[PDB]
A paper describes a structure:
The UNC-45 chaperone controls myosin function mediating the folding, assembly, and degradation of the muscle protein. UNC-45, which is present in all eukaryotes, employs a UCS domain to interact with myosin, a central domain that mediates oligomerization, and a TPR domain that interacts with members of the protein quality control (PQC) network. In addition to functioning as a folding factor of the myosin motor, UNC-45 can form linear protein chains that provide regular spaced docking sites for HSP70 and HSP90. Structural analysis of a minimal chaperone:substrate complex reveals that UNC-45 binds to a conserved FX3HY motif in the myosin motor domain.
Given the difficulties in obtaining a co-crystal structure with C. elegans UNC-45, we moved to the less complex fungal orthologue SHE4. Despite lacking the TPR-domain, SHE4 contains a functional UCS-domain for myosin binding.
Residue numbers in the entry: 1 to 222, 230 to 309, 335 to 665
The structure:
């Protein structure tokens, strides 16, 4: 099994998983190939051949069950720990060796480390020590036992600390040692050791520019002392240096409020983060970190809120961040963070308009569309929250780059409680969510006098059920908003009017009687909405108006509410429109009330001089008194 290795490490065209079909031969293929590897890994080849080799070895390694065929691999891997380009592949290989016979892998590793220490003690140069600390950092999170034993030993500390002190400008050794310290901070005993014995050294190397970032990354893992780290990450990110390490750090650290206030305080860094997010060059992993930072820093508390709105307006809105984000390629996690950003920005109603102009509504809708049959998780909910807030404060038809705002409606309906015969919604929405959904729906229902939304409601019986199920909600604001929604939907008969005004249908006639009672709701906004339902339909659909004119409970209730509450202007107007439509359609209804003297003198009081923008009050009082006159003469 010789030539297979040559074609495996010969060029990137061939693949190992490819020629895995030519392998097989478990008695011979694995053994023979391992002998080829052993003779071949006896030297260091260029980065391409080595990358092929350590991409391929893990497979074979995972297979071969005879441990004495995988011995040499420990030396081969540890002796390449300084080779950066193939370091993670080595890790993978070691992990594969670790997956089966873990203990023997770690044992051979410890033995090789001890020989490396002896070689390092006899080296007039630092090259053996570099190798040793690179091997230690490479295998530390998998061989934690032997690595902790090495790091903690006086013999290893002696040579390490001494050569560090002596060779402060051996950048490869210092850097290897700082990466070692960071990685090794995983274990607790090592962390205590580092935090008891290295603070002097770390303060020292923190003063040296070319080691500042790596030293800060060690210090993170162990107030003023922290503040200096954060200022380092911020300044070095704003410069442009070590985008990867700094963004990772700050994405973690912006989980703390003080870090956030500092970041928002530093202008240059904010411009830099926005420009990096826009920059077509930064890696997708850095883009993700940048977005995590932006979402953390833009989040409203539940730091001073005004600082957060100032930051969001200055750097996210005015730098057209949302308009750009529409165009960058986003993973699902990055899209999640962008939804977070949009949500945060909309916590300040004054910005929603601008957000929508930059395309945020579109991003919300696409996000929901793609998650619809996929992941109704917390980001789904968050997206619906942002969308509801959007639709409460903007004109709907100019809100999704000329896409249909009505496409939001199915998503809004997911924050309405389903009829309680209808499963559990994956969405953990609250009463506030339901309230805001109904506000947004009420806004959608203004389009084309409610026909568009009503047609969406009629295509799915569930939607109308979830509305009707809020007619008697115990929360005043939900009941109020429901009635406002229904009254907007009653600007066009379509067929939704049958829900209340098809008297041949028992269910509808019952809903009618309920509505008549709702005319006397204590909440004046609810009352206005109920009145507008009746007034809209009666002034707009003459068939229904003829039927309503015969419904004595409605007429008596409307008159009672007019007698006792006519000093509210919207309510008075709507009751007058209802009553006059009814009376014009039915002289026998007029004859019914011709002797209600209190009704007559309330009507006369307004036939005089209504205030405000109110021609209808005198006009309609005049009409009604005229009909009563008709009946008395």
């Amino acid at each position: 099994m010789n030539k297979v290795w040559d074609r495996i490490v010969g060029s990137d065209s061939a693949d190992a998983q490819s020629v895995l079909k030519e392998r097989c031969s478990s008695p011979k293929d694995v053994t023979d190939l391992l002998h080829v590897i052993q003779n071949w890994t006896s030297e260091i080849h260029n980065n391409g051949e080595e990358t092929r080799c350590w991409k391929c070895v893990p497979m074979l390694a995972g297979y071969v069950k005879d441990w004495g065929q995988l011995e040499f691999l420990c030396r081969r891997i540890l002796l390449r720990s300084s080779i950066q380009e193939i370091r993670p592949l080595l890790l993978v290989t070691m992990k594969s060796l670790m997956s089966n016979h873990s203990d023997n892998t770690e044992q051979k590793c410890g033995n090789i480390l001890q020989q490396l220490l002896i070689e390092a003690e006899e080296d007039s140069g630092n090259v053996s020590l570099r190798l040793l600390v690179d091997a230690m950092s490479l295998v530390f999170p998998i061989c934690l036992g032997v690595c902790r034993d090495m790091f903690l030993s006086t013999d290893f500390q002696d040579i390490l600390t001494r050569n560090l002190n002596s060779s402060a400008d051996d950048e490869h050794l210092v850097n290897g040692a700082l990466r070692l310290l960071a990685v090794s901070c995983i274990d607790e005993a090592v962390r205590r050791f580092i935090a008891e014995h290295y603070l002097k050294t770390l303060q020292q190397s923190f003063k040296v520019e070319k080691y500042k970032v790596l030293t800060a990354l060690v210090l993170i893992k162990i107030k003023e002392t922290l503040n200096s780290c954060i200022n380092l990450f911020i300044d070095s990110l704003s410069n442009g240096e070590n985008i990867e390490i700094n963004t990772e750090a700050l994405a973690y650290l912006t989980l703390k409020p003080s870090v956030r206030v500092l970041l928002r305080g530093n202008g240059d860094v904010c411009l830099k983060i926005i420009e990096l997010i826009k920059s077509q060059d930064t890696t997708p992993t850095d883009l993700y970190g940048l977005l995590i930072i932006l979402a953390n820093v833009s989040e409203h508390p539940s730091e001073n809120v005004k600082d957060i709105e100032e930051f969001n307006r200055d750097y996210i809105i005015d730098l057209d961040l949302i308009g750009s984000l529409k165009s960058i390629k986003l993973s699902t996690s990055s899209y999640n963070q962008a939804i977070r950003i949009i949500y945060n920005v909309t916590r300040d109603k004054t910005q929603i308009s601008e957000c929508v102009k930059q395309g945020a509504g579109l991003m919300l809708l696409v996000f929901l569309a793609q998650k619809r049959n996929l992941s109704k998780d917390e980001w789904y909910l968050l997206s619906i929250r942002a969308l509801s807030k959007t639709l409460i404060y903007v004109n709907p038809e100019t809100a999704f780059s000329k896409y249909s705002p009505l496409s939001a409606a199915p998503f809004l309906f997911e924050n309405l409680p389903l009829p309680n015969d209808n499963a559990l919604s994956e969405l953990q929405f609250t009463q506030l969510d339901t309230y805001e959904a109904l506000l947004a729906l009420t806004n959608l229902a203004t389009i084309n006098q409610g026909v568009d939304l009503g047609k969406i409601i009629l295509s799915n019986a569930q939607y109308w059920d979830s509305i009707e199920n809020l007619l008697l909600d115990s929360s005043v604001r939900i009941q109020r908003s429901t009635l406002e929604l229904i009254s907007n939907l009653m600007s066009n008969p379509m067929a939704i009017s049958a829900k209340f005004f098809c008297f041949e249908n028992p269910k509808s006639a019952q809903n009618f009687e309920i509505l008549v009672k709702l005319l006397e709701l204590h909440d004046i906004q609810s009352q206005r909405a109920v009145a507008a339902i009746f007034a809209n339909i009666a002034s707009t659909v003459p068939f229904i108006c003829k039927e309503l004119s015969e419904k004595r409970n409605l007429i008596e209730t409307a008159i009672r509410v007019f007698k006792t509450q006519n000093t509210d202007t919207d309510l008075r107007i709507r009751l007058l429109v209802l009553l006059s439509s009814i009376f014009n359609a039915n002289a026998h209804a007029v004859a019914c009330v011709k002797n209600d003297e209190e009704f007559v003198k309330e009507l006369q009081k307004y036939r005089n001089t209504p205030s405000q923008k109110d021609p209808l009050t005198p006009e309609l009082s005049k009409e009604i008194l005229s009909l009563i006159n008709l009946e008395h003469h």
